[PDB]
Amino acid sequence: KVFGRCELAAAMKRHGLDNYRGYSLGNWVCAAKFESNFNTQATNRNTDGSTDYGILQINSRWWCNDGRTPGSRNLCNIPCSALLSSDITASVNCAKKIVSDGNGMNAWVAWRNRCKGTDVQAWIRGCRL
Ligand SMILES: CC(=O)N[C@@H]1[C@@H](O)[C@H](O[C@@H]2O[C@H](CO)[C@@H](O)[C@H](O)[C@H]2NC(C)=O)[C@@H](CO)O[C@@H]1O
Numbered sequence: 744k745v746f747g748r749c750e751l752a753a754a755m756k757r758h759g760l761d762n763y764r765g766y767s768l769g770n771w772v773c774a775a776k777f778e779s780n781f782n783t784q785a786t787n788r789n790t791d792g793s794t795d796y797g798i799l800q801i802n803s804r805w806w807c808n809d810g811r812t813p814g815s816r817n818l819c820n821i822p823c824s825a826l827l828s829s830d831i832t833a834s835v836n837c838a839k840k841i842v843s844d845g846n847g848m849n850a851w852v853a854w855r856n857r858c859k860g861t862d863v864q865a866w867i868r869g870c871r872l
Pocket residue numbers: 778789790791793795799800801802803804805806841850851852853
């Protein structure tokens with residue numbers, strides 16, 4: 744599924760991401776925009792052979808099992824394919840674990856490079872939330 748911006752904002756809000764670990768909702772929407780262009784089916788392969796999955800491009804090196812990232816962890820205890828669902832629950836729940844892990848949203852490269860330090864509230868501007 745390719746979410747609309749506000750649709751995703753609302754979904755993320757419903758799933759408890761607004762101000763989760765101090766990260767306002769726009770951070771999460773911004774991260775999703777730049778990680779996946781709001782596409783739950785996005786996958787990208789990393790240089791180490793892991794793959795990033797879903798709307799928040801959560802990687803299989805650490806967070807999910809895709810059966811083809813040897814030596815990796817599955818800290819969200821999910822098949823990576825669950826992160827491709829049109830239902831963002833698995834991604835959100837995993838993202839909550841990630842962002843809680845001490846590094847905040849810096850885990851999301853695109854967030855660090857494209858959202859951090861910007862007016863992320865713009866990403867939820869105009870949305871009914
Ligand atoms: C939370 C999450 O999974 N974020 C992804 C990053 O992990 C991806 O970065 C890449 O992650 C792999 C596995 O840890 C690293 O080997 C790789 O070096 C790293 N790539 C960079 C450029 O840092 C990122 C890839 O675009 O996608 C999500 O942000």
